Amino acid sequence: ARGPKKHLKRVAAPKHWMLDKLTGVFAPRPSTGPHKLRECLPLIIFLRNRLKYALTGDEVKKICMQRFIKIDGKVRTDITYPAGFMDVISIDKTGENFRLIYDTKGRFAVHRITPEEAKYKLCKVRKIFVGTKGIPHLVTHDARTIRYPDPLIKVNDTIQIDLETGKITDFIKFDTGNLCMVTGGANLGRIGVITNRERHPGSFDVVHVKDANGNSFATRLSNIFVIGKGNKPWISLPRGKGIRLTIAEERDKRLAAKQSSG
């Protein structure tokens, strides 16, 4: 091409956006934001296909001009604003808050939270930057630049920010034996405990996470996310508690629920 790409087709969309195949030729390309193009959830698809509040793409922009949707506590008038992982969506009119946590399968899922849980948000730092006259800086995974943290913050460990002031309350050290979230790739949405970490110089490092039922799997170091100290989390888990049960056990529990329901 001669410049940046601007349109997006239906089947060029990622599967976790997870639309149909015959309603149009184009899919909503998100605007530029804190998250990547692939792993993000736009506001238009969320309001049109998850809560079923609106049916048509003009109704959601009418909502956004009505100033009822806030992402991370600030009113967002952008219709294709990318709301990615670990984000809080607050609606002032109806009075409910939503937090985007991956469920047991590789897709975003709704999670109704209390307002007392809706004042904080976790972040993963990408790199540590020292400023002009020795200012310690932050590079989070949500493009938030924070000045002067606690001096124990490292490359991999996660932080907690307060939404109103943008400052660190408490942090979780990345050690073997802490609770885990996986974001990306095949193993996406599994709750486990970090057990072993191996260093590969010149290439990507791989970790090993053991689930609560004894299942173990490996993910890359760049796709890791710590949510809790020990086995106790800091947020509210969705339904299923991140197990990735097999399709035979899923068939068994589905047929048991269908037989019990009648």
């Binding site: 239906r10 015959l22 149009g24 030729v25 035979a248």
Partner: protein, 185 residues
């Protein structure tokens, strides 16, 4: 670029030998016995049973105590029991290969109407299905190639808007009644 489907496939297969006596007689006997229209329908049923047998042989090729073999075998076995051509006593994967095409032709709607007792002959059953006189669970069917399930065999009955099952009289009866009232007054 237009937003269509572009997905379709054939449901019947043409045999390699066009003219020999025995298979022609066997297909012609099946067409006459079950009152079908042409050879394409029995070729379609043979194609479906061939695909089911190929899937069963592919599952029986894979060794015991595997997750996907047990999963697909139980799924195909449950579907083949629920369609009505198997029994719960014969709940095994190695009995799929012993099936014949007449068992698949038994669960057709035309022969089910003929065997239930709602029509005189099987051709009368077919021209009853094409006529929209019956229903399957408060919903009419017009297509004679309506495969039924084990729980759906009991619920078949005449439709509401039909003179056979109680309703408005047809066109010829109303025409004859109008002719009688014209001749009487």
């Amino acid at each position: 670029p237009v937003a269509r489907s572009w997905v379709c496939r054939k449901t019947y297969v043409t045999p390699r030998r066009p003219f020999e006596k025995s298979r022609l007689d066997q297909e012609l006997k099946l067409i006459g016995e079950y009152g079908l229209r042409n050879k394409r329908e029995v070729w379609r049923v043979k194609f479906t049973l061939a695909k089911i047998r190929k899937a069963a042989r592919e599952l029986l090729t894979l060794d015991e105590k595997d997750p996907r073999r047990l999963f697909e075998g139980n799924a195909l076995l449950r579907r083949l029991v629920r369609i009505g051509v198997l029994d719960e006593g014969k709940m095994k994967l190695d009995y799929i290969l012993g099936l014949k095409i007449e068992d698949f032709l038994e669960r057709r709607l035309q022969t089910q109407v003929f065997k239930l007792g709602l029509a005189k002959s099987i051709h009368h059953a077919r021209v009853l299905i094409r006529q929209r006189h019956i229903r399957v669970r408060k919903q009419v069917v017009n297509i004679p190639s309506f495969i039924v399930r084990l729980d759906s065999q009991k619920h078949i009955d005449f439709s509401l808007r039909s003179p056979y099952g109680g309703g408005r009289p047809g066109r010829v009866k109303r025409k004859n009644a109008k002719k009688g009232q014209g001749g009487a007054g």
